[PDB]
Symmetry: C2
Subunit: 333 residues, 2 copies
């Protein structure tokens, strides 16, 4: 409920991760893949576990290719041709806040090579992965957020132009959110493209919530009204037009951070309710042992990559929601 | 002390700061001045107290002038016409790692108006402070470091050019390190210019050790061997040519952070020894209650501004030394 309780829940999960961290810096995943620990540097840093976060940086650095990518180890389909750069985005942010300026420069440089200069979006499928050059809202939003942390504001602005075009070009937003555009910049409505079923409870809301977070952060960076209006449009869209699952599904953390940030920037109490309700909902789902999981309930020493990623992820969202609610209350009182 | 123990000493100092933080976000200083808490955002964030760090950001934001400076409250002469930008530099870094991108952009924008475009140095005295346009190695090094964290690498490279020219232009480096150049870039040997007596135990060593830290981070950011060679020439200068006080004085933490950083990058055991020794020395000076002080020993509720600055400063240095020694160990195992 309170920002102190969100933070305490995050510190427990971070303690759970650090106790089971491997000597090479990898987090306790049942499959050694990058999609199990890409949020690890940033998450452990915000929890104060700077030597554990630096150890993850040691692990990430040893996997780095000369071009700045980490193409292996990757197994999950979503980290191959859905949002390949989703891992690279958190890696860039986590490295930069740690002061690993060489790691973050190389990571962000590769992210830039995947930018579509015509549209501002970022390619969904990595190198040597079959695909048609499509660009999705998640790859674009996380790369734009990585652009903000590394000071590449023009890249972040161009990424917001993509999200603005993707929002206006929606053919039927009341029923479906097409989160992908083709290489020319047109909204991609192909069956094999990510499309959120908005009036239904089938998840994938972070294709809307992560753009809402990134756009609010970009507004804070620039105080350009257009980025605020688009972020509030996405929040209104998720609150009124979308199913109740938009703030219940496991991917609702992005929108919760966006609402917490929007509360500190605007003071509108509806954003505090969305942030508090989401942050509370993640606290209730936490295992007493510290981790989050879909199936596991016992005192396990490792998790499958999806649960381990979600655990480090909720460390970030609970910490971000907590400090923006705490500061928003101080500001607007 | 091991890296685990340096981090434990940092967490205790951060804990001490957080319990006494004022409702407005200010740290427990007996005088309300910016020089008492400018390292607060960065230090509290690295310790994991992200809500306390956000609170410092709110307090700092309430002081920010439209041009991005915080000229008041200031009282210490060193933050007026010796190294005025020393406070702004840590504020920029702390704001940026927190994701307060509006605060960090505005702070960095002002810092860059203080850059001398002909020399790459940053003016020692602030606006409306009497001065002649001199630039010092501390204002330049902390501004270059803030530029690295905000991703303005051209500014950092220019700051490095100033440090290299200041180093080559030393008229008597074995006796005195003149840390100040004039507006045209000539090394300033006037009596009113900062000058370190390198063969006496008279402090002010951070005019050499903070350039060494920044230049090491710039080398990590660019892998331009010129910045490594200059950083190593400054460490060798402090190790062999300079008095033992360069690694014992309260301002030695900068040299220790540079040594820890150089150990992870180069693996040379001498750098690990400098960082270990400086790290354990600061741990031994810590009070039982968690703060650092020059002459205070009781269970106090606040501190002299210089003691509070030192307390937040040793949170940073002990954490940075600890994480770089631990990661250097893993890398050079």
């Amino acid at each position: 409920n309170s920002p102190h309780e969100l933070k305490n829940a995050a510190q427990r999960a971070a303690d759970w991760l650090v106790e089971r961290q491997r000597p090479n810096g990898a987090l306790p995943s049942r499959t050694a893949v990058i999609e199990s620990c890409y949020k690890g540097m940033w998450a452990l840093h915000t929890a104060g576990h700077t030597q554990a976060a630096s150890a993850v940086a040691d692990y990430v650095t040893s996997l780095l290719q000369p071009d700045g990518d980490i193409p292996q180890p990757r197994e999950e389909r979503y980290f191959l041709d859905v949002h390949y750069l989703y891992a690279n985005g958190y890696l860039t942010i986590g490295a930069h806040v740690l002061g690993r300026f060489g790691l973050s420069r190389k990571l962000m440089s590769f992210v830039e090579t995947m930018r579509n200069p015509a549209t501002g979006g970022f390619r969904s499928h990595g190198p040597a992965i079959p695909g048609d050059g499509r660009c999705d809202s998640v790859s674009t939003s996380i790369s734009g957020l990585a652009a903000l942390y590394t000071g590449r504001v023009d890249t972040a602005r161009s990424a917001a132009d993509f999200l603005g075009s993707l929002w206006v070009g929606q053919p039927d937003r009341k029923n479906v959110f097409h989160a992908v555009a083709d290489a020319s910049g047109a909204v991609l409505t192909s069956d094999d493209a990510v499309a959120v079923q908005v009036r239904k409870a089938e998840g994938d809301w972070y294709f809307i919530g992560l753009p809402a977070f990134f756009l609010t952060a970009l507004y804070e960076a620039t105080e350009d009204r257009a980025y605020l209006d688009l972020a509030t449009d996405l929040m209104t869209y998720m609150d009124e037009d979308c199913d109740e699952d938009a703030f219940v599904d496991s991917s609702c953390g992005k929108a919760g951070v966006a609402a917490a940030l929007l509360y500190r920037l605007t003071g509108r109490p509806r954003y505090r309710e969305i942030a508090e309700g989401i942050g509370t909902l993640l606290c209730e789902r936490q295992s007493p042992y510290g981790y989050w999981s879909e199936e596991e309930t016992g005192d396990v020493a490792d998790l499958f990559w999806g649960d381990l990623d979600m655990t480090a992820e909720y460390v970030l969202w609970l910490d971000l929601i907590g400090r923006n609610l705490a500061s928003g209350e101080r500001v607007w009182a």
